[PDB]
Symmetry: C2
Subunit: 563 residues, 2 copies
Amino acid sequence: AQGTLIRVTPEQPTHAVCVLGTLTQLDICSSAPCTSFSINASPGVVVDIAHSTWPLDPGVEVTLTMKAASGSTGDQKVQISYYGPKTPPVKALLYLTAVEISLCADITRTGKVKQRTWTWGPCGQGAILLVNCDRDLDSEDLQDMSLMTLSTKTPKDFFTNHTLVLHVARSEMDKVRVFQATRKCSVVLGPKWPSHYLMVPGGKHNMDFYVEALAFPDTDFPGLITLTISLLDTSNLELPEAVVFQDSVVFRVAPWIMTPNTQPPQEVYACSLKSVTTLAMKAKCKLTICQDEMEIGYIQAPHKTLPVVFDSDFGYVTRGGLDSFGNLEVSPPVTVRGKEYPLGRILFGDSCYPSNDSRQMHQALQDFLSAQQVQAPVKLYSDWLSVGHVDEFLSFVPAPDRKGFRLLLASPRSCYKLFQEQQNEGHGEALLFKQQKIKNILSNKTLREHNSFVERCIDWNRELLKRELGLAESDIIDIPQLFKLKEFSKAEAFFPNMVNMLVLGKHLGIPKPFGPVINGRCCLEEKVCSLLEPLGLQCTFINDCGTNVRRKPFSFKWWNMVP
Amino acid sequence: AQGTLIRVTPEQPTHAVCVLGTLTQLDICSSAPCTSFSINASPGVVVDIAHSTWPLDPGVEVTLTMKAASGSTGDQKVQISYYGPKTPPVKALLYLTAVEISLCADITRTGKVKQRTWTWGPCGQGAILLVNCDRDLDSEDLQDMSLMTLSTKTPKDFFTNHTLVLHVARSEMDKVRVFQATRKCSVVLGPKWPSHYLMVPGGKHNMDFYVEALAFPDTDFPGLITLTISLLDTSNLELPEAVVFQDSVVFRVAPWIMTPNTQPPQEVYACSLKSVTTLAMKAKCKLTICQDEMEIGYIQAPHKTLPVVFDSDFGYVTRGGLDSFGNLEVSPPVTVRGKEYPLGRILFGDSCYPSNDSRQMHQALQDFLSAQQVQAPVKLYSDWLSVGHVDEFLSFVPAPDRKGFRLLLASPRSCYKLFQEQQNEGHGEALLFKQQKIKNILSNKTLREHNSFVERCIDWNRELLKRELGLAESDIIDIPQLFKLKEFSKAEAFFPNMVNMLVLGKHLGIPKPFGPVINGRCCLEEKVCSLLEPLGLQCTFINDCGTNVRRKPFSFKWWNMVP
């Protein structure tokens, strides 16, 4: 393991402490007389040595390991006999005192307290801390926190000459807060003070501390917070305190995680019309009435997962229009050229390159999402849309076969083909919605070029999503949809944007495109179903849209990922 | 590689560009009639397809690759023949225009311009940028910068319908600056503007840009800066510009690197006595006269390495007493449990745990050194010394055998033994320097305890350095040295701190410890030589210390490391 080096002499005896679990090396030649030596000691001390030898080479390795906490000070002895030529010299005396000092937490992400660094994966190590989320003591308010325990086994009179201090680095104090459990609970470490003395009794004992995080990861906080325990010697009243042994635990603050439409819906919210309440109903989901300016995510720790709302028993964060959460989505779990993204991959749009007229999500948001590493953000292209949200051109719906989902991309092409197949059939006179006929729309050269330009933007995202999400054409479904360049050549929907749907599990709430009515049945409405129904989706069309959807957190534990 | 997807139809012909080096996929069924199809095209187009097949399955993969830049627009054709049952249908027409667009730099760290991400190591990829260091155009001022070249091979009339733009992300614009070489040089990308239009002529051409970094890595700058090139289509005067192809190069800003005493000295500096000029003389090193408040390091790029001074043709940085560069050192190259540290490992001291009376190096410095990753900083314990510099208890000198160096640690023990061996011999009356006799010093119980406490602090660093630098006792040498606790129980040297030496290569300038004179020869002075000389060091003692030492940069290229 790790440890110290003791120096013994024929001069006088040496007193020293040895913490169970550490490597105690012994320096024998330093103040030695005589050519060889012999080591004999108490039963509780296993004196192992290599090149138990007899020479006096300073290359000899004499390490001691104690087998258990002593009952009193100096229970174990180590006698160093120095002999040589034709003499029987001195015997160096060493009185050790073994103690047990374990600062331990839930390093095995299992909700139960049982290599000095935090490591990802299912075969990794490291306790986890949830950030404290609250807008404006005992278990009645400490189950959300992380338990850390300090157990000690030392001789009764041990803490008359040694004192334990618990500390955090000054650079991390403003990010954590530790509570001491008196078996009330008072704050011992925090933004205020970095260190604190523990009042610990000799013998077998152990106190509980409760830790919480005060900051999600961010551009200036990787997410690790370290708590160390120091065993200080204060046996000499004159000299200052001398650190005898340190040990620590490394916590990692849980990231904020977004939830994709492929997750079972748990609750829908709406603001002050009721096609949605009938939908949630069929969708086996709850429904409660009160604004799409926030996104419901979740933080998760072995001992507790907890919904957390993100705006600009619910947590909150407020980091801060491409600049709104309506331009924020998440792919479903996906694998790309090997690398596995179990929690999906966050999708948010902006522009191809920066200009005097380029919009983008505020840099403080982008940097934040990236800081949570677990869903490695992907920049799409949406700046081409008047409003600018990626939801205006994409969507994800649950599938029952391939990868388990399907990418829906708006598609002007799929609509011209549909209106064309419609004209050929003799319905070129059908009215959409001024109200234009399916043939004027088709003959409109100007409208045609516009969509042709939109096809380009969406197609550019088709390839982007294909690369970053590792998708295949077989994972994509083009939904017939038209567009029109209005404001500053920016794009708007030429009719209810259907790909801007409320995916509530397996039941979809799609905007009704009052399109060309054939056989008393809108062709678009009809086409959309012939694309989704064979997948199991239940298409229902509504008219207009303020809604949010709290969804079920991934069974997969974010910390088992391997970013 | 990476690329686009073209949609052809029997309707009309499709025109499109294809950049050499990209994957051009073809969508055939989208607007197809008829059950099978056939693909035939110009000689310059290698039409490869898999399940050249005949079916009409949307699972068929038809990719095109051009063999070379076209001479005019639409030099290559691709004819899609759609046939089936008992019919001979349409032939879809496609006119492609191949162009060459390579934005390339020195991705092979070789000083010569020849996977879209920056990677470390000897088998890695990624150009390197030096930060601009200057205190207060042509090659006369552009050899320190990094060359980036844009080569193009397109038909003469090509840029009448397409325009190239060079950009940096807004989040990195304030960290880079790009100059355009007109074959004067003017700024095109920088803290001011993120994008810029290139005025590029059709045919074969290539322009040079010169890049420089304006910020070393830091807690808010990992060190990567990305420059992308966009090929925009502006063939339709109505619609906005449409990105056709993007490519980029990823630069990494050179870290600031510190130089250990094991490096050959190149120049010593001193401020307004001359034992040092005689020393540099024997040391085969230059010498120039004018303050130890700065540290001379270096930045290094394949095309140029350049000395850079660090304070609070020389570069400068000013990030901002444990808080001074006198508490800053660097181990020599060393290997620890496998992990290799070729540029050494930065050593800087502070305290064991944070207190009301703990000192430490300003957090902005610590964070800075870490940001340069190349020399992964190690925190030692020095807060116990009145002044607080790690140089007061350690030093590194060049060795000719083992790892190539030797760790020198001050050692009160090595001095008591030496003064004791001296007393036994009958010199217990020798005067040190009030002037105390070698026996009063030895009998002094209070002085003895003090040093005993210092032994503890140094011994705690002995184990720290052993672990982090992977040292062995055989790599350490205790220099006899005494201490005394004065100011607030803080430590000071009980006689010229010898381990605070000016290692000028193989020639050492050690503080003279006017110690007990035996045989007309100070015992300490004598002991120090019997420890160093057999290693090749030339010990010379001076009396007191303002000096700095610019040293030779490691032959090893920092970017070949693997942090």
